[PDB]
Copies of this chain bind each other. A is one copy, B any other.
Amino acid sequence: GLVASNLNLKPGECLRVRGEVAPDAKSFVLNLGKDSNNLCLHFNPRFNAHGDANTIVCNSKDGGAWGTEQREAVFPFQPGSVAEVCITFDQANLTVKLPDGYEFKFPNRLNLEAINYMAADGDFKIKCVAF
């Protein structure tokens, strides 16, 4: 899927991503960080993948190494609909805001100066990105 680099997204600046969730979607991924080996956020809604169903999986990747996975109890995505996610960070957490009012936090484990890299993958057709 789409890969964007040189984002230079600073603490407090908002990255917005709107896409279409495939009607038979199994999974999609938004990766954010410095590059493919250094992700401050791996955001992975799983509809029906890796033994999971309707679960948001989050993790980090630091110098190629996956961190400790975290999951949310809520799943505000529907196959066959448009979804928007808005991401920002401070030194402590990433804050991910989702459609139906939902907002959660994921610990900032890498302390990058900026989010420079985003990559999308899976069953999510990106329609627009706002920086």
**How close is A105's CB to chain B, nearest CB, in angstroms?**
25
A74 interface contact, C-beta 8 A = no
Our pick among B3, B5, B6, B128 for the contact of A129 (Cβ within 8 Å) is B128
B residues in contact with A7, CB < 8 Å: 2
Q: Indicate if A1 sits at the interface (CB-CB under 8 A).
A: yes
Interface presence of A65 (CB below 8 A): no
Residues of B contacting A4 in the complex (Cβ-Cβ under 8 angstroms)? 2-5
A130 to B128, CA, bound (A): 4
Q: Are A127 and B127 in contact (CB under 8 A)?
A: no
Are B131's CB and A131's CB within 8 A?
no
Instruction: Answer yes or no: A126 CB below 8 A from chain B CBs.
Output: yes
